[PDB]
Paper text:
Cyanophycin, a nonribosomally synthesized polypeptide consisting of equimolar amounts of aspartate and arginine as the backbone and branched sidechain, respectively, was first identified in cyanobacteria in the form of opaque and light-scattering cytoplasmic granules. The biosynthesis of cyanophycin is achieved by a single enzyme named cyanophycin synthetase (CphA1) that catalyzes peptide elongation coupled with ATP hydrolysis. The discrete active sites of the G and M domains are used for extending the Asp backbone and attaching the Arg sidechain, respectively.
In the apo state, Glid adopts an open conformation and is the furthest away from Gcore. On the other hand, the sidechain position of Phe692 in the apo form inhibits ATP binding but not the interaction between Mcore and Mlid. Mlid is not well resolved in the apo- and ATPγS-bound states, suggesting the mobile nature of Mlid. In the apo and ATPγS-bound states, a large density was observed between two Glid modules and over the binding site of (β-Asp-Arg)4 (arrowhead). CphA1 is known to synthesize cyanophycin in E. coli cells; hence, cyanophycin is the most likely candidate for the molecule with increased density.
Numbering used by the authors:
A (entry chain C): 115 to 723
B (entry chain D): 115 to 228
C (entry chain D): 456 to 569
D (entry chain B): 570 to 683
Write the structure that this text describes.
């Protein structure tokens, strides 16, 4: 058993080498063992997804929704056929280009939000020095924030200035950093900052950010809290854990020096003393859950903002004195909107209740108690797989559905050929199930695919087993007909509880698969006097027989005749008895899915080989 | 009547100046007239959309569907309230981020199509 | 771009804009919502508020603008607003408004029109 | 009066009044009250009180899912049921909370309920 393909193969290759080295020398060097272990760890880390992706994948697996990994851009596809959805990290196939592009433009989104009445921080553009004073009149005085018009990742932007000389030097620095000599000055808003997550137009979680700080509640200074904090298991490196190690950098040391306290200075009255002012969880900030104590008007406003920008999943930054009051009484503003936010901060608040963000996302993708599954019919057997598969496809084509079917001849999507030189393994199944237009999948499953790579799907709605004959043996580890029966039993065993297993009652080996099969069992037989079939029909039903020149279906105590068995072109007026079994199997499989009798008749009369 | 707001205001401001210059001197210099005409042409060209946008806007107007110009990124909004749609040049609000990003990656789209 | 298809220079032109507009609005439908414009000398505000309250009884989101302020359904959107085209644009651009009720004063008609 | 019910709620069983009919023992009363819990369809739910041992003993011989409600948030049976499964309700810190497995959903402050 393995969890990662490359890691599993490497471990398998290394085990035999280790055993050979032991039997050759009596012991294995420790350095080689450590090399192998670190190589395994590197392999495991390499084939790993971003934490949001594992969260969503685990949530999907908890609901029984199939998921596959596309090879293009680390995209994950949920579902099959026309019911599939795609996610990358948090962006879905429904997320718009226009909304994402607008969110990346700060001035554009600010102007859009201002036109809709949403409170936004006041600001003004200026290009000449003498105009700055006038701008100070518009913003309302001090303090102010200086930023350049064209800049990414905060190039040359100050945080807080409260007098004339610092404002002048910050403006000069920004102008020397600005590419167009023009600078926006905006009113600095003080207050607690919150990060609100909006999914499908509804607020899911609200988190309050507190800047990285220390508290002297234990009557101790930083010299001991540095080791005290290291004992918490949450601390670590990377970008997967919310609690990162406290990096005492030169900038942070200068900030705490100008903060107004010293290394040995005890906090006054027992107040938190901050180490940085960025208020970031990656830096080492603290999240607080405030989902419950939010005013309904604020929720309505945030939902309106998310709908106005045009983002299904959005992260809004708010600055307010209190989140339990409307943003009008307090001087609250909307700072920025992010199109692809991470929710690692909301899953582990570290103070409060955790919120199920992955559940909300999965509910948005699949609204009701529905999964992205499509009808699947897997046909296996020794002799007549191809004809049965083609007959099933032709019969289902009579209904207005697009049918994708794979067989020995080639892979077909509806009416037009998709692949000529294809195999009947998992590759063709993946090709069929990934098409955005296929509604019903019909797959011929040969034993070679099962032995080499196994089945390409977790479960099937209909599993047909025609017959098992030991006409060819000696391949692989299959040397006995019992082994072949066990190999063919995989299709029957991998049937969901609401599915059907269509088995041949005449063959004792195939009929022995009645047990260890979840879901209903339907028998088809060329002999209408089979004891097992009659016993099954008397208590239950759903069998198919060939009684008096007729293809009949027994639904218990009732008999439904389909065709005269001589009007079917493939039977050649009944001269070929082998094709009648395939016709019986196909008709029974189609009937188990609810297709009307007249459709089956029309499909059977028209189909040609 | 005007077709462009800035062009119309400029023409209105220029007409009275031209008439005052005529009644003051008896004629208007040709260089100033050419300057005003080229300024009007520049104003008309400045407040113009990409040809796809005029095509779609004309088609929408032929069907009596209201259209407005948003001030963010040259986006055009059709309709009112819950029945509105947005287009930039040919991208709609229904166009996905994933599809656009995949189309820009040649190797990724080739591997997907294969 | 579809400028190449509109003017093939050899063959028949194709209506790409028509196809795009059909994709945006499938049937013979437009992006219009119910609009009620109230004008008068004396009782515009009371009539507008009464209309909004009556329509609110039906399960619809109503956006209405009057002298007091611009309201989107139940929650106040703008306190210090005018009854001109600006409030109308604010009402009609909201992605949740289904019925618009607007008080139209003569000042807005004289200054900027409807 | 019905063959099956979608939701069957059993609050508590106390032997405050006995001697009627053939019900003279609290076990007989528990068996009589167990009819509602037992007559629940496989897709239904049985809402039982985890604090009462007699009511909690009805966990077996019941078709369909079982949901426990308790006034004590430290009940061992409720926590064990939530760890493997979920759908319980508790009163933890002045809150009416619902446990859906590893998640807690708070409803009311328990003092705003009249």
């Amino acid at each position: 058993e393995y969890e990662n393909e490359q890691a599993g193969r490497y471990a398998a290759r290394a085990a035999v080498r280790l055993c050979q080295s032991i039997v050759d020398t009596g012991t294995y060097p420790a350095t080689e063992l450590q090399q192998d272990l670190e190589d395994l760890k590197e392999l495991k880390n390499q084939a790993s997804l971003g934490p949001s992706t594992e969260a969503i994948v685990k949530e999907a697996e908890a609901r029984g929704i199939p998921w596959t990994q596309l090879g293009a851009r680390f995209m994950i596809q949920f579902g099959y056929g026309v019911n599939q959805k795609k996610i990358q990290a948090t962006l879905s196939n429904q997320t718009g280009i226009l909304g994402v592009e607008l969110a990346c433009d700060k001035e554009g989104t600010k102007r859009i939000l201002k036109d809709a009445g949403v409170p936004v921080p006041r600001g003004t553009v200026a290009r000449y020095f003498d105009e700055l004073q006038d701008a100070i009149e518009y913003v309302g005085g001090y303090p102010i924030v200086i930023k350049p018009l064209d800049g990414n990742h905060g190039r040359g932007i100050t945080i807080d200035v409260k007098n004339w000389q610092e404002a002048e030097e910050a403006y000069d620095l920004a102008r020397k950093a600005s590419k167009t000599k023009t600078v926006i000055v905006e009113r600095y808003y003080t207050g607690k900052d919150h990060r609100v997550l909006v999914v499908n137009g509804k607020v899911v979680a609200v988190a309050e950010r507190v800047p990285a700080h220390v508290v002297g509640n234990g009557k101790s200074t930083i010299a001991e809290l540095i080791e005290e904090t290291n004992r918490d298991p949450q601390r670590g490196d990377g970008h997967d854990n919310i609690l990162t190690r406290i990096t005492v950098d030169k900038s942070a040391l200068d900030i705490l020096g100008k903060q107004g306290y010293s290394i040995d200075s005890i906090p006054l009255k027992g107040k938190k003393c901050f180490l940085r002012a960025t208020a970031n969880l990656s830096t080492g900030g603290i999240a607080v859950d405030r989902t419950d104590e939010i005013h309904p008007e604020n929720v309505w406003l945030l939902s309106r903002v998310a709908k106005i920008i045009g983002l299904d999943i959005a992260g809004i930054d708010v600055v307010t004195e209190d989140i339990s009051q409307p943003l009008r009484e307090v001087e609250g503003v909307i700072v920025e909107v992010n199109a692809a936010p991470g929710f690692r901060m909301h899953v582990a608040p570290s103070r409060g209740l955790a919120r199920n963000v992955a559940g909300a996302v999965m509910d948005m993708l699949f609204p009701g108690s529905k999964n992205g599954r499509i009808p699947i019919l897997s046909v296996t057997g020794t002799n007549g797989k191809t004809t049965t598969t083609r007959l099933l496809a032709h019969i289902i084509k009579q209904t207005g559905k697009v049918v994708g079917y794979t067989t020995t001849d080639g892979t077909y999507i509806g009416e037009y050929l998709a692949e000529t030189g294809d195999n009947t393994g998992p590759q063709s199944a993946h090709l069929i199930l990934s098409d955005p237009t296929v509604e019903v999948a019909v797959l011929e499953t040969a034993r070679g695919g099962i032995l080499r790579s196994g089945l390409g799907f977790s479960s099937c709605e209909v599993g047909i087993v025609l017959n098992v004959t030991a006409d060819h043996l000696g391949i692989g580890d299959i040397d006995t007909i019992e082994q072949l029966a066990k190999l063919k039993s995989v299709v029957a065993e991998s049937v969901m509880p609401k599915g059907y297993a269509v088995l041949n009652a005449e063959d004792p080996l195939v009929a022995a698969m009645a047990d260890r099969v979840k879901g209903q069992v339907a028998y088809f037989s060329m002999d209408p006097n089979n004891e097992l079939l009659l016993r099954h029909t008397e208590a239950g039903g759903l069998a198919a027989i060939y009684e008096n020149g007729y293809i009949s279906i027994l639904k218990g105590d009732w008999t439904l005749r389909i065709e005269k068995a001589v009007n079917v072109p493939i039977t050649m007026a009944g001269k070929a008895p082998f094709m009648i079994a395939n016709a019986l199997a196909a008709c029974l499989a189609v009937f188990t899915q609810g297709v009307k009798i007249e459709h089956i008749r029309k499909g059977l009369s028209t189909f040609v080989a």
